[PDB]
Every structure is written in C-alpha cells, then in structure tokens.
Amino acid sequence: MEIIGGKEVSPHSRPFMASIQYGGHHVCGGVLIDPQWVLTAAHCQYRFTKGQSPTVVLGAHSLSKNEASKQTLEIKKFIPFSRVTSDPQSNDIMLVKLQTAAKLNKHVKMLHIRSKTSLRSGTKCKVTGWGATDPDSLRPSDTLREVTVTVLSRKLCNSQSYYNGDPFITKDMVCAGDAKGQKDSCKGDAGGPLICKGVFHAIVSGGHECGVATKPGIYTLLTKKYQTWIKSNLVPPHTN
Template identity: 40%
Template sequence: MVTMLILILLPVAFLLPPGAGAGEIIGGQEAQPHSRPYMACLTIRREDKNFRCGGFLVSENFVLTAAHCNGDKITVSLGAHNVKQREQSQQKISVRHRIPHPKYNRETTNNDIMLLQLEHKAELNEQVMLIPLPPAHQRVQPGTVCSVAGWGRTSALSKVLPDMLREVDLKVLDDEACLKYPGGTYRNFKTRTMMCVGDPKEHKASFKGDSGGPLVCGETAQGIVSWGPVNGSPPRVYVRVSTFIPWIRATMRKLQP
C-alpha cells in the first residue's frame, strides 16, 4: 500500500486516490531561514477542501510540483520560512495555468509531475531564487546524499504541522532497492520515471506534507516528492526530473508570453 505525500490541513480522505494516504519530513531539522530560496508553498483548493504541497521555482513565472497536488485553485507562496506568519519576504502569486503531465496516472502515480504558470513573474532577490534543473536523462549515482525540505509533519504519529521549513538529508538508492523490496510495496515503481530514495535502516524520510518539493542533489533539483509506504518508512519514491526535461522545456516555451 502506498501513500501520496500531501501536507493536509483538512481531512485527507476525499483528496486522494483509493488506497492512498498522505507525506512529511521525518528525522530532520529546521532549515536555516531562506537557505532554500527556490522553495514554494502551495495552497490548494479542491472542491470544498484546502491542503498544501511543496514546489520549487524553476523560472521567474513557473513552479514545478507533483501532479497529485492539482486542484481547482492554487496560490503559490515564495520566500517563506514560517508559513503561519506574513513575512516581508513572502510573495503570494496566483496560478494562471496548471499543467499536469499528460500521461500522469492517478492509480499508479506514474508521471507525477506538474508545471504551474504564475499570474506574473516572481521578483527574484536573496529570499526568492530559481533552482537549476538537471540535464535531460542524467542519472544520480546510488549512494549520493541529497536533501529534501518541506512544511510537513515531523512524525507518523503526530498531526501537528510545523510552521517552519524543515529539511533532511537522504541517500539515493539503487533502483533494485525498490524493485526487489519484499511485500510488493513498490510494485508500481518505474525506473525510467522514478527514483528510490532513503536508507531503510535510517528513520529519515519525506512524508505527510512534502509532496511536490524538490530532492536537491548538489545544487540541482533531481527529484520531486511523490509517494511511499503509508507508515512513513523509507525508501520513498521521487519523480526522476531528468526524464521530463524535454517536456518541461517545451511546455514552458509554449506558454511564455
């Protein structure tokens, strides 16, 4: 059984596909304020429910996130650290176009990637910056230590959501770690479009709340928080961003004014 990784403000039961639950930073620490100026906090309205996801700024007017974070209306907050405060650094921008990948599969969570075109360009400064994307089809070496951040819950048992951005370092695993994991937990794992991340021996993971946020390797956004076991245990599954570079570039070109 797998879980979507969404930071939920209201009950999740009606927001996710059948058999899915929700995701968070487990075993991490508070990030240095504004040390990740590419981070976006998404407030999503879907029917009569509100929830939040993560995302990251890849162009002055485009944010990348997970397709399962789609909704009827999305507002992006850039330059945030404490999402409960109206920090002077924050820029709130409405989303003009939501473009989930045309082959996104809600049942298997394959191609779980979405571009958001903002109503207007973000103002880039020390608190709001872009993050580079990898070259097309570049693969991250197993054993590489990357990091992920989000405003999600800090334990599988706690329902309290932290106000501050939190982060954790995670190891990229060989695809086989997910493919051959006992019990069929990762039966929907696709090596071309997904990454297997997080040492199962360590109690560290993205979980309830970090969907759509970037897995950062070096200075590059190599992954997007996507799904994993319902109990929050690693490894977790991330979108392999490099596979989608041609689609990302073509979509942004098409929509640029």
C-alpha cells in the same frame, strides 16, 4: 542512537522553495524554475474542487507568520504530465503556471533543473519541504526543513521486501531513504526537490507514508521525458 528526521534550515536559505496552497493552507512543496513557473508533483492538484483559491507562496520560511520576503501569487493553471495510464505512482510531476511573474531577490530565486548529471545509488541527497515531523499529524511543519536521505538502487527498491513491483520503480523514478529504507518526510512533503551534490535531481512523489521501514520515499526523476515536457511549456511566455 535513535530518532532523527527533519532539521530546520536557516531562514530563507533555500530561496527556490515554494509552498503550494489551497485556501491559505500548505498541501505541497514546489520549486520555482522560471519567474512564472513552479515545478511540483501532480498529486498536488486537488481534482475534487473547481475552486478553493489555489495559490503559491514564495520567499517563505514560516507558513503562519508574516515575513517581508513573502510573495503570494495566484495559480493561473495546472499542467500535470499527460497520462494514458494514471493511477497512483506514475509521471507524478506537474507544472504550475503563475498568474504573474515573481519578483526575484535574495530570498526568492529560480533553481535550474538537472541537464546531464546522472544520479548514482548510495549518493547523499537533501529533500527540502514543510513535511510534518510526526506521521500522525494532520498539519505540516510550520517551518521549512531538510532531511538527508540516501539514494537506493532500483534493484533493491523493486525487490520483494520493498515495493515488490507495485509501485514498480521505473527509470523515471527513484527511491531514497535511511539505512532502514524508511521515508522521513511526512504530510506536506510532496512536490518538493530532491537535491544531491548541488544538483536539482527530482520531485517528491505524493501519496507515500513516512515512518515505515522498507517503504522509502519515491521521487520523480527529472529525466529527458520531463525535461522536454518542461521545455515545451516554457514557450509561451512569448514576447509581443
């Protein structure tokens, strides 16, 4: 009748998962959508450094342990959605071009973004990531976890007892949490996928506290605004 937020998934059962890392430490999740591309949240780009050797780790389960299926690729460049009005909560989605192509196998595969499936409020969804299980933890969960969440109506999420228009939940955004409107994934959860009924529907927006009632998780819905954006960048790669 109390406490429950984050069940550990079977090792390598979410082959599409990627770990965005700076200096070898996880700061965000992400999804591999093409051999050389990873989709994640714009919040995951540390704009306060020219270096810190940013990389992506594929085929992993434990962040610290060595694993046969682990692949560490260097990030060639960050391409966050263009913005005229940045500020917290707004087009929090980013494409990460990998330095080289990832090797595909049972533990490392690509996940297709939604194409036309709509998302109703009340639907059951799973959020996958290394988010910490403790709200006061500076470190992420060592192992990949998954939290079940329910999609909330924009109407309820934009109400006064919730975000009260600030952040305002647009059509390109979506809220999901538990019966109490609470967000269960903590630090290191941003950039991961919101999956519902086997469909890749959205990216976890960064900068939102967990464990706080009426303050549900905010995800960046993969609408036509981004799909087009993603498609334009998928070329290049070219050919010869």
